[PDB]
Structure 1
Amino acid sequence: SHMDHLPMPKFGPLAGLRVVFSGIEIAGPFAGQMFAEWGAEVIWIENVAWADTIRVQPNYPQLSRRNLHALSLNIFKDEGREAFLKLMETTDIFIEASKGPAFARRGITDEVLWQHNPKLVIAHLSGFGQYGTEEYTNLPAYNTIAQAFSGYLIQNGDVDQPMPAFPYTADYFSGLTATTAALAALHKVRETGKGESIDIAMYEVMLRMGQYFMMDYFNGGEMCPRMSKGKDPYYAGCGLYKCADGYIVMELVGITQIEECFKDIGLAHLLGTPEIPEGTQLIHRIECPYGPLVEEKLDAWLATHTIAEVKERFAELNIACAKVLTVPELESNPQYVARESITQWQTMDGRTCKGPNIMPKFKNNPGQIWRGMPSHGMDTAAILKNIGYSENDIQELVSKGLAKVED
């Protein structure tokens, strides 16, 4: 009835949307919790005997589990499964992260889910997909493995040292993709009244994100080299450089930009040559015989100049650049301050917690932080009551080990 709902402020583009997620750590819960940043009612399912392993992390979970309601229920066993499937009847979106088609193996097929709610949007997040070969389909999902398997890892790092993107980059791309896809499927529901199942394989997500140069390989050209110390694989004066008192990123692009920079770095005599003709806008480091010399002289000029000096000079010449900010430099940055990009909120246990604000910024229906990370099973009793369980019913579930209520 009208009294049977979880209380929370009405806000955001997703007010009134009912999302439930089953999963631990980053990828799945990130996908689920994003809905909550933007106003949805999101229920975080944890197992009864053991909580989400994210909780071991000392601070991150205060951000990654904010705005959530906590259910602790064994969704695969007896009366716990009955409770889970009852919950599905009023759920709009269900997100789960598993080792392949684990839900189907345990008897909760999409068919079973749709029996309880034909409108349900189901997002399955896995390392290798819901179907494929016997060898790969049921393997564990890890960010490093997804990067390794997708060709993402091999293109990150230094010339002679590949490295993964950090931190847990594949988990975030995959989780975000799941949010996106579920919202898209939701659109279809609002016209047809028929749900959807989404097969998000982490390696396919990362495959797409690594295509900029890989498309050359697939279509008759060559795969790009890895960066050298964060410098562009192809274009001189682009990427990461070291100054006297820290790092900068820069983009040496444009006629006057190249002309005046060359003069500064002692290479004026290279201008107007066949190798660097009048009107050159971009220097290809491999194709141009002077590529390595340009880098040598650029490094030397930057090495003896401070970031402020470099920024001042690059501002004069309209060369796009930015200091590589260290973590201690973010909070006091005037743009961060003006936009309240880092904010504070209260934890459930009375402490001020610091971290990023809601992103992005919706004008008419902005997101907000309305509750800190909940404890294990904190909202179990309320959720079960809302879907028709008596106090006696809930007690029975708890004694049978099928649910856990508040600490």
Structure 2
Amino acid sequence: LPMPKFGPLAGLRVVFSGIEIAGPFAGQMFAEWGAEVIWIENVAWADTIRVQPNYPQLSRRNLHALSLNIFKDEGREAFLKLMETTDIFIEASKGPAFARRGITDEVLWQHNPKLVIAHLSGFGQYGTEEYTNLPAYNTIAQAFSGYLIQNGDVDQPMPAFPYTADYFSGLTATTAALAALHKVRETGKGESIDIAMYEVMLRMGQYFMMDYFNGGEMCPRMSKGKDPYYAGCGLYKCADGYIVMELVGITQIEECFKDIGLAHLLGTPEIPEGTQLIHRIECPYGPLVEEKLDAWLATHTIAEVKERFAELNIACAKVLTVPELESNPQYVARESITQWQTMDGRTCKGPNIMPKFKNNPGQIWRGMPSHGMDTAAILKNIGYSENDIQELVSKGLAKV
């Protein structure tokens, strides 16, 4: 298909089937970085992401849109033909739904033995009958993985937001698919990848869970955004706003304590010389440290705290609100937020390509396409005549 040559993934052909966040995020990331990516949508039901007024202009940029019944008669034929020149196919569905519909990995590989197939589901491609075919949702994946129970406040768990598990799961699929693609270069044989959202999230939540698994205790939840184990780390309130800080290092602790009224604790058996990180539970003075830290910070502005903390080499930052990002000097200097044109000629604002590749940078070359916009071009590209396409459309098997 016509598109500029750019990025590390120029020339790669990626196809995805899925809706909403997790699967499409995985597929579209290839498009950020130069791949030819085809978004498959159902003929009767467009991707529900399109209900949102602005997000999809970002989350579906740089894509080609195919609308095809990939499971029925000529529609299935056209889909399996497409696979013959596809490098990576990503699909998100409820367990082994593709196999139940007659599109097994084996059938995909009959059409392209080199194909890298990524299956993204809530609970995996196999397991028990009770869980395997259950719906995939971000909240459920967080609930089921131990991630949710570690988020929120001491007496109020909550999910990480927004839809954190969908992003982790999608990104993992992209990563895994690129890894499998590497192996195809050497062997000429494809791969199938079983990405279960709860397993992705299990891994992301191990920092303290590893203690529980190996004889120790699970950590508590944060109290008002303060770290559950490390004093002076996390979220604090100043006079005119919130900050985060990380009270780490020998001099940092000594100088900070001088400021807040706790110079007398330095050199004690509880906070001995050379202490570089305070554990709030193990240290009897943990609660006192927080009382004095809170009191000192509450009488100072963010600007004052940042100025002192810079003098003391204490890591910190203002908690930015969304309205403060666009004018922030680092954002401006790095063009972190940019603008592009939608397919219907309106200006859209949003994040630039990340990360920044030096030799082969990504770029935004196309706005989000409409439902079935590229169907005719795609089918022509894989050998369908104009009459064939008109016939697919008349049968209800494709939408142009």
- Could you tell me the TM-score, scaled by structure 1's length? 0.97
User: Who is 2:256 aligned against?
Assistant: 261
Deviation (angstroms), 1:277: 1.9
User: What corresponds to 1:356 in structure 2?
Assistant: 351
User: Alignment partner of 2:119: what SS?
Assistant: strand
**Partners of 2:157 and 2:60 in 1: CA distance:** 32
What is the deviation of 1:279? Answer: 2.3
Task: Provide Cα deviations, 1:51-93, integer angstroms capped at 9, x if missing partner.
Answer: 0000001100000000000000000011100010010110000
When structure 1 is superposed on structure 2, of 338-347 and 267-276 the one drifting more is 267-276
Distance in structure 2 (CA, Å) of the matches to 1:67 and 1:387 = 20
Specify the SS of the correspondent of 2:372.
Answer: coil
Structure 1 stretch 281-290 or stretch 110-119: which is displaced more?
281-290
**Deviations 1:155-204, CA, capped at 9 Å, x for gaps:** 11111111101100000000000000000100111111100000000000
Determine the C-alpha separation between the residues in 2 that align with 1:280 and 1:41. 53
Deviations 1:216-272 (A, max 9, x none): 111111111111111111111111101111111101122221112111111122222
* Deviation of the 1:48 alpha carbon: 0.4
**C-alpha distance in 2 between matches for 1:10 and 1:380:** 21
Q: Distance in 1 between matches of 2:277 and 2:34?
A: 46
CA–CA distance in structure 2, aligned partners of residues 62 and 127 of structure 1: 26
Provide the C-alpha distance between the structure 2 equivalents of 1:103 and 1:300, rounded to a whole number of angstroms: 59
Shift of 1:150: 0.4
Out of 287, 290, 296, the residue aligned to residue 292 of structure 1 is 287
1:278 offset after TM fit, Å? 2.3
CA distance in 2 between partners of 1:31 and 1:255 (Å): 43
Name the SS for the 1:350 alignment partner: coil
Three-state SS of the structure 2 residue aligned to 1:114 is helix
SS at match of 1:125: strand
Q: Secondary structure at the residue paired with 1:250?
A: strand
Separation in structure 1 between the aligned mates of residue 147 and residue 347 of structure 2, nearest angstrom: 38
| Range with greater deviation from structure 2 (195-204 or 230-239) | 230-239
CA RMSD across the alignment: 0.7
Deviation at 1:361, TM superposition (A): 0.4
TM-score (normalised: structure 2) = 0.99
State the secondary structure of the residue aligned to 1:99: coil
* CA distance in 1 between partners of 2:321 and 2:353 (Å): 22
Unpaired runs of 5+ in structure 2?
none
Indicate the larger mover: 276-285 or 339-348: 276-285
Whole-Å separation in 1 of the counterparts to 2:267 and 2:190: 64
Deviation, 1:94, is 0.3
Cα distance per residue 1:300-346 (max 9 Å; x no partner): 11011100000001011110101111101111111111100000000
Q: Look up the match of 1:107.
A: 102
Partner Cα distance (1:253, 1:388) in 2? 63
Partner-residue secondary structure (3-state), 1:217: helix
Q: Deviations over 1:74-131 (max 9, x none)?
A: 0001110001001011000000000000000000000000001111000000000000
Q: Which residue of 1 aligns with 2:191?
A: 196
Distance 2:103 2:277 in 1: 57
Partner of 1:275: 270
What number of residue pairs does the alignment pair up?
400
